[PDB]
Amino acid sequence: GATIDPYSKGLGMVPGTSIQLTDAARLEWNLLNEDVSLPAAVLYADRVEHNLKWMQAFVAEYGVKLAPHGKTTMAPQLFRRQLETGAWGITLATAHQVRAAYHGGVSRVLMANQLVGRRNMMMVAELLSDPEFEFFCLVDSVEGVEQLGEFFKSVNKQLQVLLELGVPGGRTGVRDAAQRNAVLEAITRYPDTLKLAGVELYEGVLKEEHEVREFLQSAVAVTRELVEQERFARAPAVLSGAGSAWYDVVAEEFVKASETGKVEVVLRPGCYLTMGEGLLPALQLWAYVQSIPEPDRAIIGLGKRDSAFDAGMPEPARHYRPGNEAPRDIAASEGWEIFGLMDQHAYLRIPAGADLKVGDMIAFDISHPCLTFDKWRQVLVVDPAYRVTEVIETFF
Amino acid sequence: ATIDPYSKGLGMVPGTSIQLTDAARLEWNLLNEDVSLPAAVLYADRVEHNLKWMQAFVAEYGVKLAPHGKTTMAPQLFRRQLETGAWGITLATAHQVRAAYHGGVSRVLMANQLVGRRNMMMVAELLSDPEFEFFCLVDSVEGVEQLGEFFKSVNKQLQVLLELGVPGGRTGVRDAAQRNAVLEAITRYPDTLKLAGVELYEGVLKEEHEVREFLQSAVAVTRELVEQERFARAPAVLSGAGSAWYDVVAEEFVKASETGKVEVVLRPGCYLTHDVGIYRKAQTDIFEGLLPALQLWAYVQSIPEPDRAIIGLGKRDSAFDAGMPEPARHYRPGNEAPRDIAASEGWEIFGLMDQHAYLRIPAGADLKVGDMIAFDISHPCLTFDKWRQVLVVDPAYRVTEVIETFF
Ligand code: NA
Numbered sequence: 001g002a003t004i005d006p007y008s009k010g011l012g013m014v015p016g017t018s019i020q021l022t023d024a025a026r027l028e029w030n031l032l033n034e035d036v037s038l039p040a041a042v043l044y045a046d047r048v049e050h051n052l053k054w055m056q057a058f059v060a061e062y063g064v065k066l067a068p069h070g071k072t073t074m075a076p077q078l079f080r081r082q083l084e085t086g087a088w089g090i091t092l093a094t095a096h097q098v099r100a101a102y103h104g105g106v107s108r109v110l111m112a113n114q115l116v117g118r119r120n121m122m123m124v125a126e127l128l129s130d131p132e133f134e135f136f137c138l139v140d141s142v143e144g145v146e147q148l149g150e151f152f153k154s155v156n157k158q159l160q161v162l163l164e165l166g167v168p169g170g171r172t173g174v175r176d177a178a179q180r181n182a183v184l185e186a187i188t189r190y191p192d193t194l195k196l197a198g199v200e201l202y203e204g205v206l207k208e209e210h211e212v213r214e215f216l217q218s219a220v221a222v223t224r225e226l227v228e229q230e231r232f233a234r235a236p237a238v239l240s241g242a243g244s245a246w247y248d249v250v251a252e253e254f255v256k257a258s259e260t261g262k263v264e265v266v267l268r269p270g271c272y273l274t275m276g277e278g279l280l281p282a283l284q285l286w287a288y289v290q291s292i293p294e295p296d297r298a299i300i301g302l303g304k305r306d307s308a309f310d311a312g313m314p315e316p317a318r319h320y321r322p323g324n325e326a327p328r329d330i331a332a333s334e335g336w337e338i339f340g341l342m343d344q345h346a347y348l349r350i351p352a353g354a355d356l357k358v359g360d361m362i363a364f365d366i367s368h369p370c371l372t373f374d375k376w377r378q379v380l381v382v383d384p385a386y387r388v389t390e391v392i393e394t395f396f
Numbered sequence: 397a398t399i400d401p402y403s404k405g406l407g408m409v410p411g412t413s414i415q416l417t418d419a420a421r422l423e424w425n426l427l428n429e430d431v432s433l434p435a436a437v438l439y440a441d442r443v444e445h446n447l448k449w450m451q452a453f454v455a456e457y458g459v460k461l462a463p464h465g466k467t468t469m470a471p472q473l474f475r476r477q478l479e480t481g482a483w484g485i486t487l488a489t490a491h492q493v494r495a496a497y498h499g500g501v502s503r504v505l506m507a508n509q510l511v512g513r514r515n516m517m518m519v520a521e522l523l524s525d526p527e528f529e530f531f532c533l534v535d536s537v538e539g540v541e542q543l544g545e546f547f548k549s550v551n552k553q554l555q556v557l558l559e560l561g562v563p564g565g566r567t568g569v570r571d572a573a574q575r576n577a578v579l580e581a582i583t584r585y586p587d588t589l590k591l592a593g594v595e596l597y598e599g600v601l602k603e604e605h606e607v608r609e610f611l612q613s614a615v616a617v618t619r620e621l622v623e624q625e626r627f628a629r630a631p632a633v634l635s636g637a638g639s640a641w642y643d644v645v646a647e648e649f650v651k652a653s654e655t656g657k658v659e660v661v662l663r664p665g666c667y668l669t670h671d672v673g674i675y676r677k678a679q680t681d682i683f684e685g686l687l688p689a690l691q692l693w694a695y696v697q698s699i700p701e702p703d704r705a706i707i708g709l710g711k712r713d714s715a716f717d718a719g720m721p722e723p724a725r726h727y728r729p730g731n732e733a734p735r736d737i738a739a740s741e742g743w744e745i746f747g748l749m750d751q752h753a754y755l756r757i758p759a760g761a762d763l764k765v766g767d768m769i770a771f772d773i774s775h776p777c778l779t780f781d782k783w784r785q786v787l788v789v790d791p792a793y794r795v796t797e798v799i800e801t802f803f
Pocket residue numbers: 001002003004005
């Protein structure tokens with residue numbers, strides 16, 4: 001129960017099976033003392049807290065609240081920090097994810113996805129006898145609504161749904177007004193079970209601004225009509241877009257729905273580990289130099305098992321020789337560059353005669369940090385002296 | 397070893413101490429929608445068919461195999477491999493060795509350099525088990541000295557294999573100077589490091605005359621060390637991959653395989669498909685074989701346009717290196733059984749996002765929200781690190797066991 005996994009990678013010696021993650025400090029792991037198996041995933045406590053407090057300081061120019069997507073870390077320890085620093089809820093994608101977040105103390109989850117399949121539905125139904133828990137999922141088809149309605153009725157629960165709008169050539173969401181009206185009608189056939197709680201879209205399938213505005217404006221018109229018809233079962237109704245790349249455009253268009261006093265706008269941002277200019281990169285992967293077979297080629301103990309290829313090639317940022325007081329920063333001018341990532345190894349180009357030895361450590365930055373998280377069941381949190389203060393568990 | 401109550405791809409797990417091997421008692425049936433989709437599904441009868449085939453193959457040709465476990469990291473599967481004749485399991489990292497040890501593997505060839513005090517300590521802890529045999533690779537004086545000093549300081553002994561490499565390659569000594577420097581360094585730790593043999597990965601090379609030359613060098617270095625009596629293990633181990641280049645390796649290692657001073661150990665990959673080198677290359681010699689044993693099951697979530705269905709399967713569930721998922725079976729809840737999907741149905745996955753996939757279908761397809769599709773993937777072993785728990789089913793789609801992974 002929120003205990004360190006003694007068989008995971010990227011850890012030091014774990015002398016019991018019930019050592020609380022938050023008690024990791026008593027194990028006295030220090031990264032520089034080689035207490036920890038490399039490769040390891042390392043969050044800097046000072047930077048994580050910086051990024052949290054930075055986001056907390058953010059005063060929006062518009063009436064909008066944030067439900068950051070949790071799928072990139074799947075770490076309820078981080079979700080709780082996000083919620084205590086002002087997030088409205090967590091956006092998740094699967095029933096499995098929702099259960100994980102719920103048992104990690106998240107009390108509001110926007111499942112930005114269709115809920116389908118008997119076990120996925122039951123996994124959500126299991127959380128719905130908690131009167132303090134708030135849940136939403138998306139609907140975009142009559143069949144999907146009927147499946148939800150029949151199931152949740154059969155287990156005597158209520159389920160909040162958001163009508164999802166979509167676009168031609170897009171992903172999910174109703175494509176036109178006739179579909180929209182059929183989906184809305186289907187919901188009224190389960191009056192004691194399904195509860196229309198708002199409207200949702202993902203505007204980022206579109207590329208041009210005029211298309212985005214026109215899509216946002218159709219969502220506003222549908223929302224205002226449902227307000228006027230008193231067809232929402234939640235007060236306020238929720239209107240949600242991604243609002244990342246299109247943050248400004250989404251806010252401008254969605255204000256028109258808010259002006260009813262009956263709708264709250266909820267946006268669904270991504271990674272906090274890099275609203276955004278002052279965020280600091282909080283995660284590095286640390287690996288050993290295992291072999292330097294040629295004067296310009298080093299082999300590193302880091303592979304695709306440790307670092308998502310969709311995160312981008314790892315970039316050497318720090319160098320540390322065991323026995324030294326501290327690491328040193330690697331300057332771009334040194335030309336240390338990963339030119340190959342295999343399963344468990346990386347190829348590092350170095351200038352001939354570089355001061356690098358087998359057994360040295362390198363800390364790597366990665367461009368899209370959160371995408372790497374799913375390669376790590378345990379992520380370390382370190383203080384500025386590289387002492388591990390906490391272990392973060394993930395639920396992938 | 398118990399079922400993780402918080403994992404994906406499972407049914408209702410009603411306790412925290414349900415043994416993985418007692419999964420059948422939970423009575424999960426895939427077609428009854430007892431299990432959360434997406435799920436990774438191994439077919440028991442196919443896994444067993446593949447193991448039995450490799451067992452029969454090893455008896456025909458006398459080959460010693462240490463199959464790669466790095467791609468599945470599933471000691472339940474490792475144990476079956478060893479029970480049906482594997483010589484040991486080949487692994488990549490100290491963490492993996494420890495997991496395999498914990499899962500009852502009694503011989504590991506770590507086909508990698510062992511570097512770093514915690515990594516070394518993790519291996520040292522296991523060496524207190526006198527029934528466990530371990531090997532790792534050395535390719536540098538610095539690496540040999542770091543191992544020697546560490547294992548001497550914990551009063552243990554370590555078997556190492558000299559790794560031969562090639563210019564522009566991966567690891568391994570490049571030339572005779574480098575080779576002799578590594579061997580000499582080994583001899584500086586006479587009661588700690590035990591030279592147990594010679595290893596290479598020949599498929600860094602692409603042309604055949606190069607591979608043969610490299611293999612020939614391996615045989616020559618081994619023979620030389622046999623004559624000088626530099627090995628501290630009888631027999632000494634000579635190990636090549638012998639998968640993608642199985643037929644060439646088999647020929648070149650002829651004389652080492654024939655002697656009793658040396659045992660040849662090959663390192664095949666995936667036993668969950670016909671697409672493994674040792675099997676593809678054995679066909680000439682052989683003239684029902686290896687079958688694909690894994691499929692990923694997912695729901696249809698939305699059919700928003702007549703030619704486009706959205707599937708609850710993403711890059712979180714299906715590794716890019718495994719290949720694009722291909723629809724293979726279709727099941728509508730309430731029905732007796734799935735149906736086979738042929739290419740002529742016109743279903744094809746055209747996009748895989750984080751948690752969703754795009755399925756092209758012909759307008760008017762026999763498909764509905766809430767149906768399940770089973771997908772084939774080209775390299776099934778390579779998708780295991782997306783799953784902490786993998787289901788095993790019997791022919792009636794009843795879950796008979798859950799397989800845990802150590803990634
Ligand atoms: Na635990």
